[PDB]
């Protein structure tokens, strides 16, 4: 009935699935209601405010947690589901081949991916295209010593990895292909961003981006008002921006927009139903693992807690009214 009471009740397993969801599928019905505007006149003016507000701005889980919660390549962003039956691992597979195709790699291309996670793309490009020179950046130790490992474990040749916050890193290096997955959501600085991306670009080269939106606006990942408990214990910084599909299209100061595709967010709610699912039936290992890097079985009932509620949460989020409303918006650009 308020913030602690029911953030008390979630910690200590009190609060039943159904409520849980129900919980949470209530709070994005009110961002739904504080997003859609009555006239197109009046959300324009709402986009745009939104906008032109965009253009003024040590811990680690282990990998063997990690591999105990996601898919074989541990994707941590929306995968894409052909079968009813299809498994998180080949919803992993269908997701890097749309990439591939929707990026346009061709065998030759030196590819940069940037915020590469734990490398699932960069490992799928180097293994299909053994003629790209592929460099994964990413900002986290552990995932370019995870990254390097597997691709040694399947001897991968054209694969290296860049350790930098990419809002700080500089390099004359330019790239004949450029992907960005999962990771614009995260970047302070848009414009700044995309105009430091045309850098490492030439006239030939690609841009592919994907990031979770809503169809119709934009929203900062926090609480509208104090019954949303959620938000904030999902991103407790919640530098989480949601773009609305088309807020990219806005920010072509440096590059030209060529193709824009959107994939209907039951895939997300799938993949992170997928990884709910996993967790559960890894729950125990799970515990076992996370003990020693956190000392306590309370710190790692918190930290399965916490990671839980996000894919109960994004369950929510992504499947609210089959998919069409929050979802995965993604484009190709080139360079000016
Ligand atoms: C949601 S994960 C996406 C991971 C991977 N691309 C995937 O599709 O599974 C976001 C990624 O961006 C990285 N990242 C966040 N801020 C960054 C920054 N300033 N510089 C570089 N990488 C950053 C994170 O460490 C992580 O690898
Ligand atoms: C601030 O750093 C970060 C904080 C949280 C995350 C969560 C991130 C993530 C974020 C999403 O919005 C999402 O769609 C529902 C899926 C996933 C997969 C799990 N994955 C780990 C990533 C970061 O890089």
Known sequence: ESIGEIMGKLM???IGDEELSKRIKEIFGKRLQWGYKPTHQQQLAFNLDFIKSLKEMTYELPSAFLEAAFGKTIKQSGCYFKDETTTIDEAEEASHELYCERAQIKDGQTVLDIGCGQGGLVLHIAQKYKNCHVTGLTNSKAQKNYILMQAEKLQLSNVDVILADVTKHESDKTYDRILVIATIEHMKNIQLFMK???????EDSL???????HKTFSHHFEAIDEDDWYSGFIFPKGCVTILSASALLYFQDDV???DHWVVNGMHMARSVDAWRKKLDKNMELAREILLPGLGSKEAVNGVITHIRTFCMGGYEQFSYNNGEEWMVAQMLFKKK
């Open 196 to 202: 430091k991306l045309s850098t490492w670009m030439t």
């Open 256 to 258: 030209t927009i060529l």
């Open 12 to 14: 200590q397993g009190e």
């Open 207 to 213: 841009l592919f981006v994907d990031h979770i939106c």
